[PDB]
Amino acid sequence: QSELLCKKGCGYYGNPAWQGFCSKCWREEYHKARQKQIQEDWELAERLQREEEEAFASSQ
Amino acid sequence: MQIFVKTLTGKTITLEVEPSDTIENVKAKIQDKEGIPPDQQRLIFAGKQLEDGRTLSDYNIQKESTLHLVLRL
Amino acid sequence: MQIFVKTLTGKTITLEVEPSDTIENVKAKIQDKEGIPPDQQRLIFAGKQLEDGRTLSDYNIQKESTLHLVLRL
Ligand SMILES: [Zn+2]
């Protein structure tokens, strides 16, 4: 019972290295943030795709 | 380690890589499997287009990481 | 960092660990020294039996901390 308790409040102790979360809660957060990069990257990929197709057709 | 390259057309290439591997060498690896030439490949990770002379480690591409592939025209 | 594992039979194993190390990996470390298999090991800290898939940091095992070892039968 101190300030070191996990930030999700699941009872286990957090780690300074994992920004306050425990091992299991940090995994969920990590997966959550990774899900977001894939999504954003897919959106970037879409833009680059549209642009390559436009730049192509801007030839012949 | 292992990372994944998702195409926009429903393919996920699974590559066998090391953090030391250059982006250029990763694009050679994609050629080995998909037959797409390195200079016809745009790789994306965390909102950046991946630069040829840099390495996976330079971008913090770790275990399980997922990039995207766009073809050049 | 360094933590200590006291047996009930007059042995104190001194381990070299990191807060990120899993309980399972700590039990592998004990095997390296004592030859006791991980599945024959119960670890105790602050009144709890230590769960395999959790880490030292999950239990607030810091520098100098002392656990106990009971053998399974
Ligand atoms: Zn937690």
Curated annotation (Swiss-Prot), chain A:
Q: In which tissues is it expressed?
A: Detected in brain.
Could you state what the record's PTM comment says about this protein? Answer: Monoubiquitinated.
- The source's superkingdom equals Eukaryota
- Cellular localization per UniProt: Cytoplasm; Early endosome; Recycling endosome
Residues annotated as binding Zn(2+) are 6, 10, 22, 25
Assembly mode: Heterodimer with RABEP1. The heterodimer binds RAB4A and RAB5A that have been activated by GTP-binding. Binds TSC2, GGA1, GGA2, GGA3, AP1G1 and AP1G2. Interacts with RAB21, and with 100-fold lower affinity also with RAB22. Interacts with ubiquitinated EGFR. Interacts with RGS14; the interaction is GTP-dependent.
Record protein name field: Rab5 GDP/GTP exchange factor
Swiss-Prot record, chains B, C:
Tell me where in this chain the PTM Phosphoserine is found. Answer: 65
Q: Where is this site: Essential for function?
A: 68
Ranges in coiled-coil conformation: none
Localization per Swiss-Prot or TrEMBL: Cytoplasm; Nucleus
Q: How is it modified after translation?
A: Phosphorylated at Ser-65 by PINK1 during mitophagy. Phosphorylated ubiquitin specifically binds and activates parkin (PRKN), triggering mitophagy. Phosphorylation does not affect E1-mediated E2 charging of ubiquitin but affects discharging of E2 enzymes to form polyubiquitin chains. It also affects deubiquitination by deubiquitinase enzymes such as USP30. Mono-ADP-ribosylated at the C-terminus by PARP9, a component of the PPAR9-DTX3L complex. ADP-ribosylation requires processing by E1 and E2 enzymes and prevents ubiquitin conjugation to substrates such as histones.
Kindly list the residues the record flags as site (Interacts with activating enzyme).
54, 72
Location of the Glycyl lysine isopeptide (Lys-Gly) (interchain with G-Cter in ubiquitin) covalent cross-link?
6, 11, 27, 29, 33, 48, 63
Q: Which domain of life is it from?
A: Eukaryota
Outline the extent of the Ubiquitin-like domain: 1-73
Q: What does this protein do?
A: Exists either covalently attached to another protein, or free (unanchored). When covalently bound, it is conjugated to target proteins via an isopeptide bond either as a monomer (monoubiquitin), a polymer linked via different Lys residues of the ubiquitin (polyubiquitin chains) or a linear polymer linked via the initiator Met of the ubiquitin (linear polyubiquitin chains).
Q: What is this protein called?
A: Ubiquitin
Which species does the entry assign this protein to?
Answer: Bos taurus
Q: What is the lineage of its organism?
A: Eukaryota, Metazoa, Chordata, Craniata, Vertebrata
Gene (name only): UBA52
